[PDB]
Write a protein that binds this ligand. Sequence first.
Ligand SMILES: [Cl-]
Ligand SMILES: [Cl-]
Ligand SMILES: [Cl-]
Ligand SMILES: [Cl-]
Ligand SMILES: [Cl-]
Ligand SMILES: [Cl-]
Ligand SMILES: [Cl-]
Ligand code: NA
Length: 129
Amino acid sequence: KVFGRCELAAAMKRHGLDNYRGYSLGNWVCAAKFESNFNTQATNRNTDGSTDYGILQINSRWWCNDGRTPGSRNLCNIPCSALLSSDITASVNCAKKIVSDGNGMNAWVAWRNRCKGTDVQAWIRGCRL
Ligand SMILES: [Cl-]
Ligand SMILES: [Cl-]
Ligand SMILES: [Cl-]
Ligand SMILES: [Cl-]
Ligand SMILES: [Cl-]
Ligand SMILES: [Cl-]
Ligand SMILES: [Cl-]
Ligand code: NA
């Protein structure tokens, strides 16, 4: 599914991401924009053989099982396929674990490089929330 900007802001708020670990909703919308362009079916293969899945491009080295990332973990206890669903529940619940890991949203390199310290409230401007 390709979400609209405000549609995704709403879904993320519905699932308790807004101000989760102190990160405002605009930070999460911005991260999703640059990770996936709001496409739940986004995938990206890394040089190490791991794969990133879904609207927040969650990686198979730690967070989900895809059966093809040797030595990896599955700390979200889900198949990586769950991260490609039109229903963002699995992505949001797994993102809550990731952002709790110690480095906050710096775990998403695209957030650090493209969203951190910018006027992220622009990402929810106009939205009925
Ligand atoms: Cl947009
Ligand atoms: Cl915000
Ligand atoms: Cl594996
Ligand atoms: Cl595990
Ligand atoms: Cl599995
Ligand atoms: Cl949803
Ligand atoms: Cl933090
Ligand atoms: Na894994």
